[PDB]
Write a protein that holds these residues in place. Structure first.
Motif, PDB file in Angstrom:
ATOM      1  N   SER A 153     -12.133  -2.572  -3.709  1.00 23.49           N
ATOM      2  CA  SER A 153     -11.024  -3.505  -3.860  1.00 23.49           C
ATOM      3  C   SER A 153     -11.111  -4.315  -5.147  1.00 23.49           C
ATOM      4  CB  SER A 153     -10.959  -4.448  -2.656  1.00 23.49           C
ATOM      5  OG  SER A 153     -10.566  -3.753  -1.485  1.00 23.49           O
ATOM      6  N   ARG A 174      -9.668   4.443   3.579  1.00 21.70           N
ATOM      7  CA  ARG A 174      -8.977   3.896   2.412  1.00 21.70           C
ATOM      8  C   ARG A 174      -9.095   2.378   2.402  1.00 21.70           C
ATOM      9  NH1 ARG A 174      -2.982   6.123   2.649  1.00 21.70           N
ATOM     10  NH2 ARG A 174      -2.350   4.051   1.918  1.00 21.70           N
ATOM     11  N   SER A 175      -8.953   1.804   1.202  1.00 23.37           N
ATOM     12  CA  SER A 175      -9.400   0.434   0.956  1.00 23.37           C
ATOM     13  C   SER A 175      -8.586  -0.596   1.724  1.00 23.37           C
ATOM     14  CB  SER A 175      -9.354   0.125  -0.537  1.00 23.37           C
ATOM     15  OG  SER A 175      -9.872  -1.167  -0.797  1.00 23.37           O
ATOM     16  N   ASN A 193      -0.928  -4.662  -9.374  1.00 23.29           N
ATOM     17  CA  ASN A 193      -0.598  -6.037  -9.001  1.00 23.29           C
ATOM     18  C   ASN A 193      -1.280  -7.035  -9.927  1.00 23.29           C
ATOM     19  OD1 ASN A 193       1.038  -5.257  -6.850  1.00 23.29           O
ATOM     20  ND2 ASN A 193      -0.672  -5.251  -5.402  1.00 23.29           N
ATOM     21  N   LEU A 228       0.639  -7.077 -13.138  1.00 23.14           N
ATOM     22  CA  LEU A 228       1.864  -7.869 -13.023  1.00 23.14           C
ATOM     23  C   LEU A 228       1.573  -9.364 -13.102  1.00 23.14           C
ATOM     24  CD1 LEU A 228       3.595  -5.913 -10.131  1.00 23.14           C
ATOM     25  CD2 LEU A 228       4.496  -6.111 -12.450  1.00 23.14           C
ATOM     26  N   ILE A 237      -3.191   0.273  -6.035  1.00 23.03           N
ATOM     27  CA  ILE A 237      -2.080  -0.654  -6.229  1.00 23.03           C
ATOM     28  C   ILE A 237      -2.560  -2.047  -6.648  1.00 23.03           C
ATOM     29  CG2 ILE A 237      -0.441  -1.971  -4.780  1.00 23.03           C
ATOM     30  CD1 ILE A 237       0.816   0.469  -5.900  1.00 23.03           C
ATOM     31  N   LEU A 254       0.695   5.425  -7.164  1.00 26.60           N
ATOM     32  CA  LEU A 254       1.262   4.338  -6.366  1.00 26.60           C
ATOM     33  C   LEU A 254       1.315   4.703  -4.883  1.00 26.60           C
ATOM     34  CD1 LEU A 254       2.349   3.890  -9.407  1.00 26.60           C
ATOM     35  CD2 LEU A 254       4.124   2.561  -8.317  1.00 26.60           C
ATOM     36  N   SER A 255       0.145   4.891  -4.264  1.00 25.32           N
ATOM     37  CA  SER A 255       0.119   5.203  -2.841  1.00 25.32           C
ATOM     38  C   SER A 255      -0.980   4.530  -2.032  1.00 25.32           C
ATOM     39  CB  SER A 255       0.005   6.718  -2.627  1.00 25.32           C
ATOM     40  OG  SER A 255       1.194   7.377  -3.010  1.00 25.32           O
ATOM     41  N   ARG A 256      -1.889   3.776  -2.641  1.00 22.40           N
ATOM     42  CA  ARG A 256      -3.017   3.216  -1.907  1.00 22.40           C
ATOM     43  C   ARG A 256      -3.382   1.863  -2.500  1.00 22.40           C
ATOM     44  NH1 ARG A 256      -6.501   8.227   0.122  1.00 22.40           N
ATOM     45  NH2 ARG A 256      -8.346   6.935  -0.267  1.00 22.40           N
ATOM     46  N   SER A 257      -4.028   1.027  -1.683  1.00 18.54           N
ATOM     47  CA  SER A 257      -4.299  -0.345  -2.104  1.00 18.54           C
ATOM     48  C   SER A 257      -5.359  -0.413  -3.193  1.00 18.54           C
ATOM     49  CB  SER A 257      -4.722  -1.194  -0.911  1.00 18.54           C
ATOM     50  OG  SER A 257      -4.806  -2.559  -1.274  1.00 18.54           O
ATOM     51  N   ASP A 258      -6.346   0.483  -3.161  1.00 17.71           N
ATOM     52  CA  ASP A 258      -7.318   0.555  -4.244  1.00 17.71           C
ATOM     53  C   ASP A 258      -6.715   1.080  -5.541  1.00 17.71           C
ATOM     54  OD1 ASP A 258      -6.864   2.903  -3.012  1.00 17.71           O
ATOM     55  OD2 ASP A 258      -8.929   3.614  -3.019  1.00 17.71           O
ATOM     56  N   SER A 304       0.798  -1.220   0.000  1.00 24.41           N
ATOM     57  CA  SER A 304       0.000   0.000   0.000  1.00 24.41           C
ATOM     58  C   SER A 304       0.832   1.272   0.000  1.00 24.41           C
ATOM     59  CB  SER A 304      -0.931   0.020   1.208  1.00 24.41           C
ATOM     60  OG  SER A 304      -1.438   1.320   1.439  1.00 24.41           O
TER      61      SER A 304
END
Lengths: 428, 350, 350, 428
Positions: D372, A395-396, D403, D406, D399, D393-397, A15
């Motif tokens: 998500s 945030r998620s 991923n 990739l 990132i 490139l700073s949060r899971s929603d 994250s």
């Protein structure tokens, strides 16, 4: 068959835009498990260490190619063919193969990823929910969440000596009303901090605001007026949780409160905490003293162990040995549990079982470098220790845990109960 | 955590299950010694004749178990004088509390260990995770409660319901996973039973031909209603690996003399329902020492065992093969397998 | 987006599959008309004798299709009597480009609609997603290339490999999903075939008894090597819903007169391999009009059809019961099914 | 069987702490699909409508109980028993059932959730990946990521009149090197913004920084300095994408740049954009003019259509009719695709197919309130669009999409092609 057929690893981003190890495990019957490892500390003497390349031409120095290669060669040829339903076997196999007490040779991230992926594959093989695979009982306890609303000195430039302030919605009959209260109080807190002319635009790593408050009293009063502005009564519906992490401003035996420009000893520091304790509806003090000052910890447990809950994170670092020493010395009455700090699931279970038989309460925790995996919600539901620290509502990587808890609460409608205020075992 | 005792008992059952392939005729026993909230011991019964789970768990810890707690999945044996009883080791170690999942299945032994422990002031709790610990030891519990062997029925069939193939065919209706499962069940079981017709047709050897840490060849039983012909080239007459027993109702004098010269033991049983008395055979196998029995192959033998309701669990190996007047069987290929109340299968090739 | 033509052909194939149950003996055809990048028309062929897919698509857009593009699953008919020629409708509507997946399966017709379209200057492309459009229309393609019906073999069997229950039981070895699948296959197929022995034992009515849009009762064929007995209480003698044809090699004079009085048509065929000539029967079926054939029940009939390589696809309904020497079936219950190269099944309720 | 057996809905929370609808669809064969709907606009005139309760005693006024109930009654009894492999039938069934052009009666969130869940269930039934289910070809094109690094006008109070400044790592042979370049440039940009005395306290909604920059020239120069200081050459490895969104500062026909305190007409505004075009390696201008100023849009496409890529988001609002009008009038050069702006998957496919046959390039887009779910990554891979806009490139929603990309590019290792600079079809 439930024997391990394939183990694979890859370098993904967490994250915070940093590389981390993500492991897939496939059994012979086709069961598939997937696990991502949250980022932890790569140096120290107490916790399990994390292996990084240290290559400047790579990401920054944070490429995890060595950990992935260690998995793919050594751990893949070590744990292949073992029965995935025997977690102790795989865990002790990796511990023996690594051969060090701090997991230096293979890194803790590799071992933790392999163990979690194996557990998920075994749970998928049996066609069970993961919390029901971990503990198969009838009645379950839904965790009471602590929501990090205000961040402080280490996470921002605030002139605030305190680190984290959280809200605990413990006056409700269900988890849904507690989550609604947390969301409404978060929005009203944003509006209140806007009304007082503070810088609110932006968000922290844990979803909490980091305004330029003048003092800790201002932060607590702002939180309380945000609670009473959203339609809920403080002290009956919403309580306050603290997180000083006092290791930062401890030097030469003196607690340096730079916000008020004071140098305090131990006993007067506990006196200040007590003044706060019957000043506000505050029931938690996590790392309220340094991890090297055990005499002050014993004093704090003596004179405040029956009025609040004292949590230890840097004190016990999710270690059974240090926890056992603290139990025999009689220090604190809670522990904060992090999976990354020990490296395997079986040692985590051992630590929480030790805490449960000692009479302590366990709090499952999160890390700063979180991923999309929501394993700690299932872990908190399965062990029926209802308290969780999984961030705020912004945030998620912090919302996925609450969404999983909502799904669990609706799929266990009769057999899931919410221990609102009974979950704080500190009196009687 | 709130269900700590259940957690420790579940770990004990996992340790007990670790000895799945090598403990018969002894049961599955695990043990965990917990002191000061930390597990310091592990034990499980792994091979017949070796140390019991409690002894294997308590020897390594020395005498640091003074005042600890024991989680044991079965009642410790006290009447057994072959070895020093596990209750004696528990008492000398200094365990304050013993938690037992199930009582001993034998009624004459059940409760003796609990009382013997409670004489010395040890706290005994019985009944934690009892159903799981009774399902784990289904073979031993059935054998002790009934004094009859546990019966496995296993056979392979084609898509149209034919077990045997036509003459000259490759005689392979099973894959590698079926091979592994068959040899694992051979390792688990204490006996193997076939018919005379299967012996004269296939000429099989009933040993184990895959990798196990401890290879345990089952006792061979050959069922024949009438014994008149004995072949020298039979592979079951070799007594090097296991033991072969001929079950019969009417045996010729020449056959009896030949078997006496060869050292093969024959059993004479009465006739019932176009077969030998299967109930008497089960009673005799229970009395002599076999705990679990495996029946493989033969339409006559399988049908006779099924008609008397003596089978406790089944195994079927269904292959995508059509068996007909073809000299070579014609392979198929599955397309949709929808598993529900009844399996629905679709095949495209051929 | 880069593969737009494949996308439109996939949508056309989905529309073609929308008419899966109620189109035989006509094929399965879909149609998309695209102008200015927007789909403004849709069509699929449903019911025999109704509007064709191209006509159904182009009758709603009277004059907005000028200069459009057509994605059509099958080559449009030129001289066939199913409908007025769709090439004429395409030419009059003003389609600029036509994309066809497959050519017509009949060699005498294939390549003539393309030439008729290219006479008027229309751009024709043939070969986009051809394999999928040939697999979707497997029944029609097989019938047109071979002039013999597509045939299904379907039967239900127990765990031990027995098809027929003992005399006196409920005669149920199938669940509700098997019932639904059986009646859907009956609706799809143009014929239903059983044996004389199956009709004697069970007395079945081979209609469709499920809730679907349009009921298409299959044609009934009764196979009997020797015809000597005619029963008045047979359910197949009722001609209100479908038609019944008796296939035989030797027929009695009284039986023939009774069938002539009843209006039942009999077919006299030579004898081959302990059966009637099945190849001649298939040729006659192809000549008279049946496109799909369904064979259900009867070990004799199924074995006759299987070992002669006639069967194209199979269907097996396996239930957890044991059928051996008892009037009531011993109901089992599966525990775990591992589906691989060969199915491995475990069950214990007996 | 692939017929729909059960449809269920839930009120969950999105990445901004606001309720949204989640739908689970279970077929007769046991195939399971789950879909979450990102939050969109709840009012308007030319966009699909989102339904909310409007109850103040609830969350704030925004709870989705009406949409969930509409699903559970009407849509569940409407689409039950239909074949899940026929997306068109289900979508037009819901369209006909609702009976309005803007989906007012049932809300666009309900319909979009049902359609996406049905697609996921159908893909799981066939045992295929979602991108391979959407389009089954051999060679696939990996999208070129555009990464938001600076947020301006509406996202922060920092006197920057333009909304977003973005980096495009288009000088690499693989997606992994592009992602590494984005990571390194992001970290070096943080360090550069720190070294210049700018406050970088916190992160934005889309993962990008919002510093108190003085002008847009300073923002572009800071981005180029970060590119140079991260080890890459600007103009060969990293290009710059823009997002003015000039609908905010367009009043009375005047483009008002408040940062420089100027009022400009259309023609001088395109002149300014062109000065930027041969001033910097800038190839994108998204919403460079207002959505009501179509004459200026035509002139901009005339005299800048062959030098950069012209993107329209508020101009075409993912609408086939407005896009067709823009094509026949010859306006813009690309289209930004959002799923919830039209409400169904089949209409999205129709819009992108029209854009593809017209000669335009398609850019799959994200939204402010994200979940998500990672639909858009599979959508961008499946349709072979060489561009994607999925945040920083700073949060899971933000990132989770990278991923997924990739994992896709290692799953398609031989058959994945990265069109670095050829993905921008604006010259020749």
């Amino acid at each position: 068959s439930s024997q391990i057929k394939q183990v694979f690893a890859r370098q993904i981003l967490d994250s915070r835009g940093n590389p981390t190890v993500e492991v897939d495990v496939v059994l012979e019957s086709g069961a598939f498990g997937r696990a991502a490892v949250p980022s932890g500390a790569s140096t120290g003497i107490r916790e399990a260490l994390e292996l990084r390349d240290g290559n400047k031409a790579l990401f920054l120095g944070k490429s995890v190619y060595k950990a992935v290669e260690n998995v793919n060669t050594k751990i893949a040829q070590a744990v292949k063919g073992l029965d995935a339903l025997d977690q102790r076997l795989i865990d002790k196999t990796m511990i023996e193969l690594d051969g060090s007490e701090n997991k230096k040779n293979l890194g803790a991230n590799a071992i933790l990823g392999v163990s979690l992926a194996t557990a998920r594959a075994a749970a998928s093989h049996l066609r069970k929910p993961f919390y029901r695979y971990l503990m198969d009982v009838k009645e379950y306890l839904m965790p009471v969440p602590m929501m990090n609303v205000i961040n402080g000195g280490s996470h921002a430039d605030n002139n605030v000596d305190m680190q984290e302030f959280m809200i605990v919605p413990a006056g409700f009959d269900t988890f849904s009303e507690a989550l609604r209260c947390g969301t409404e109080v978060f929005h009203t807190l944003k509006k209140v901090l806007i009304a007082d002319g503070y810088s609110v635009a932006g968000v922290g790593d844990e979803g909490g605001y980091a305004p330029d408050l003048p003092s800790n009293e201002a932060a607590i009063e702002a939180i309380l007026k945000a609670v009473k502005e959203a339609g809920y009564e403080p002290g009956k519906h919403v309580f306050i949780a603290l997180d000083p992490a006092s290791s930062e401003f401890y030097k030469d035996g003196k607690y340096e409160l730079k916000s008020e420009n004071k140098s305090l000893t131990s006993e007067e520091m506990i006196d200040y905490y007590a003044a706060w304790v019957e000043k506000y509806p505050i029931v938690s003090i996590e790392d309220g003293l340094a991890e090297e000052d055990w005499a002050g910890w014993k004093l704090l447990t003596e004179k405040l162990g029956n009025k609040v809950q004292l949590v230890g994170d840097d004190l016990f670092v999710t270690n059974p040995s240090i926890l056992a020493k603290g139990i025999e010395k009689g220090i604190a009455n809670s522990i904060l549990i992090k999976l990354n700090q020990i490296g395997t699931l079986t040692e985590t279970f051992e630590a929480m079982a030790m805490a449960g038989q000692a009479g302590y309460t366990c709090v499952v925790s999160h890390r700063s470098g979180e991923t999309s995996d929501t394993i700690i919600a299932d872990l908190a539901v399965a062990t029926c220790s209802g308290q969780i620290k999984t961030g705020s509502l912004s945030r998620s990587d912090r919302i996925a845990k609450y969404n999983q808890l909502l799904r669990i609460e609706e799929e266990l409608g009769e057999n899931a109960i919410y221990p609102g205020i009974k979950a704080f075992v500190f009196n009687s | 955590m709130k269900n700590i005792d259940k957690y420790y008992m579940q770990q004990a059952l996992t340790l007990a299950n670790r000895g799945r392939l090598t403990v018969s005729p002894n049961p599955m026993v695990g043990c965990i010694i917990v002191k000061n909230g930390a597990i310091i011991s592990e034990g499980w019964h792994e091979t017949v004749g070796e140390a019991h789970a409690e002894v294997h768990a308590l020897i390594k810890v020395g005498d640091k178990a003074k005042g600890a707690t024991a989680y044991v999945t079965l009642e410790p044996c006290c009447h057994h004088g072959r070895t020093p009883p596990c209750t004696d080791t528990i008492i000398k170690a200094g365990i304050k509390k013993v938690i037992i999942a199930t009582l001993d299945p034998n009624p004459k032994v059940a409760g003796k260990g609990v009382e013997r422990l409670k004489n010395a002031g040890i706290t005994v709790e019985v009944g934690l995770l009892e159903k799981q610990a009774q399902e784990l030891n289904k073979i031993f519990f059935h054998y002790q409660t009934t004094k009859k062997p546990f019966v496995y029925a296993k056979w392979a069939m084609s898509l149209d319901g034919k077990i045997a193939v036509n003459d000259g065919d490759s005689k392979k209706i099973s894959s590698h996973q079926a091979f592994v499962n068959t040899h694992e069940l051979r390792n688990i079981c204490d006996a193997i039973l076939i018919g005379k017709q299967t012996l004269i047709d296939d000429n099989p050897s009933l040993d184990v031909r895959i990798n196990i840490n401890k290879i345990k060849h089952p006792t061979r039983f050959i069922l024949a209603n009438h014994l008149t012909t004995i072949n020298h080239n039979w592979r079951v007459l070799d007594q090097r690996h296991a033991k072969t027993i001929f079950v019969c109702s009417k045996i010729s004098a020449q056959v009896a003399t030949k078997l006496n010269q060869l050292g093969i033991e024959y059993w004479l049983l009465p006739q019932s329902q176009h077969q030998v008395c299967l109930d008497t055979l089960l009673e005799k196998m229970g009395k002599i020492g076999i705990t679990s029995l495996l029946v493989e192959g033969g339409n006559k033998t399988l049908n006779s065992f099924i008609n008397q309701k003596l089978v406790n669990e089944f195994y079927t190996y269904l292959a995508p093969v059509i068996i007909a007047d073809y000299n070579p069987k014609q392979q198929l290929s599955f397309n949709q397998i929808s598993v529900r109340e009844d399996i629905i299968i679709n095949s495209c090739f051929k």
